[PDB]
Structure 1
């Protein structure tokens, strides 16, 4: 249970996610729902909220990166963004609920190997989802198989009008965390940014997809003490893919090959080309993000480049 200091600390992207076990992180997730007013406002059963989170945890696998601790991070970032940008002013509790609950469920039952792998290798998955985000489809399908189980049904006191709405909302947001759609989504978002209209449901739907996207890859925003380990974790998972592809005679992405990559090169690429554009467009709507999220993205890039000439002198 929760230290009033921690209680404060948890809302900030600083927060050291490595000082926490699973079952403590679960106690943190429980807190966020209570704190955000979700439990009161959607008559969530407090036992059933605990049981669901266990049910959820249970169904993430032990991958180097795509494990429960990713999910917790993404959630905790969404919670963080909710306080930073005062999102409870700009969204309904039913939107807020959707964001949190998506965030938690978004990379569920991840097998460790992305869609590219799923597709190329004709996996039962990609067969079953016809090469359209077989992962991210599955994530949802699990997410609701879980919620179907009455003891893990935290929506049990929401009537069908509510549920239908949340279901669509979650399914959108989870499916947007395929990166194949990153520029697609980022373009459409910039288009609507010219004259952003908090009245306009398509604008908010985009905004929401962005927010979870920001979270689905916020790692580097955190302190580097905290952030860097994830990179190793990610790479470890990546090389674990390519080795199996190189084995089975399947395509290998340049970002996933042992020989071609370095930690320093790949992250410079990702920070400058993917992250800072996304967190820039979002800074337009919420200025308070420059300071808290762009700053330690700028720093993290400045570090990786000094680490680049150190990767270049050695080899």
Structure 2
């Protein structure tokens, strides 16, 4: 008659494939099911012999290792993985990548922010936290994310890779590590040039080229909120600042340097996103379009719109601050 929520309706399974899928409409359970479906759907369960029950526990254990942060939480996790999923279709990645690579992109996307503490690397380093000390100031967050990802995959009951020859595990593990560590925005500029370089004459056969592409791909999905529909996109800006301000305050109480872009007294939903969209998002997606031109209409388009919308929104804010 009427089936429970964790039984995705054939409509859901259809929307899930596109970047428009409203990420806010579901509860963890439902989202967990979505992720589950993704692995079966991409043939990952099939091509690697992933025990379906294990996939269930793994995802459940993954969801449990994400803190309840305003921004870097389980729903964000979902966003990145779902956006990665979208791009697999939109770009026909299965025509360019081996099922193994696809496994990497997806698993990596899902694990990229495991146990994120709600404070960036700059804070971890200045506050000389355990993460900072443990990782010798080298992308402590990402290094931690990655470690937790594999601590989980080390639990036999969650080891969704239990039936992969050891030679494969090594290749998958390497790839994931690379990708997850590539999400530290500190390395953005560096990664973009490496990619832009090999781009002058891309080569899907060349391995280094492909690793950069996978790197660029996970980065895209990771900060792809602004690509999403304006209603689903805006609320995340609030979550983000909610986190940035939480850190800027703490930094102030503890007398640690405060990044201006996180300063509660200088930031507004507008000024924050305008620079990010114009100078980080657009350019990155721009160069990716060179390889997958259908990305221009599906992701570059909403970005241009959000840029204008936010730019105009500041234009307005300035006029108001003026009257006063």
TM-score range, shorter chain: over 0.9
In the alignment, the residues of structure 2 paired with residue 75 and residue 210 of structure 1 have an alpha-carbon distance, to the nearest angstrom, of 14
In the alignment, the residues of structure 1 paired with residue 65 and residue 317 of structure 2 have an alpha-carbon distance, to the nearest angstrom, of 38
Deviation at 1:116, TM superposition (A): 0.2
In the alignment, the residues of structure 1 paired with residue 212 and residue 22 of structure 2 have an alpha-carbon distance, to the nearest angstrom, of 30
In the alignment, the residues of structure 2 paired with residue 311 and residue 118 of structure 1 have an alpha-carbon distance, to the nearest angstrom, of 34
Runs of 4+ in 1 over 4 A off after TM superposition: none
In the alignment, the residues of structure 2 paired with residue 147 and residue 159 of structure 1 have an alpha-carbon distance, to the nearest angstrom, of 15
Out of 3, 14, 17, the residue aligned to residue 8 of structure 1 is 14
Summarize deviations over 1:173-207 as a string: whole Å, max 9, x none.
Answer: 00000000000000010000010001100000000
Tell me the residue number matched to 2:60: 54
Summarize deviations over 1:292-314 as a string: whole Å, max 9, x none.
Answer: 00000001111101111221122
Summarize deviations over 1:100-157 as a string: whole Å, max 9, x none.
Answer: 0000000110000000000000001100000100000000100000000000000000
- TM (norm. structure 1) is 0.99
Tell me the residue number matched to 2:312: 306
Summarize deviations over 1:37-67 as a string: whole Å, max 9, x none.
Answer: 0001000001000000000000000000000
Deviation at 1:5, TM superposition (A): 1.2
1:114 paired to 2:114:
no
Tell me the residue number matched to 1:77: 83
In the alignment, the residues of structure 2 paired with residue 310 and residue 232 of structure 1 have an alpha-carbon distance, to the nearest angstrom, of 19
- Report matched runs for 1:201-216 at 5 Å: 201-216=207-222
Deviation at 1:263, TM superposition (A): 1.0
Unaligned runs of 5+ in 2: 1-6
- TM (norm. structure 2) is 0.97
Tell me the residue number matched to 1:223: 229
1:240 paired to 2:246:
yes
In the alignment, the residues of structure 1 paired with residue 13 and residue 81 of structure 2 have an alpha-carbon distance, to the nearest angstrom, of 15
Asked if structure 1 preserves the Cα contact closer than 8 Å seen for 2:8 and 2:30, the reply is no
Summarize deviations over 1:257-299 as a string: whole Å, max 9, x none.
Answer: 0111111011010000000000000000000000000000001
In the alignment, the residues of structure 2 paired with residue 20 and residue 206 of structure 1 have an alpha-carbon distance, to the nearest angstrom, of 33
Tell me the residue number matched to 1:290: 296
**Number of aligned positions between the proteins:** 315
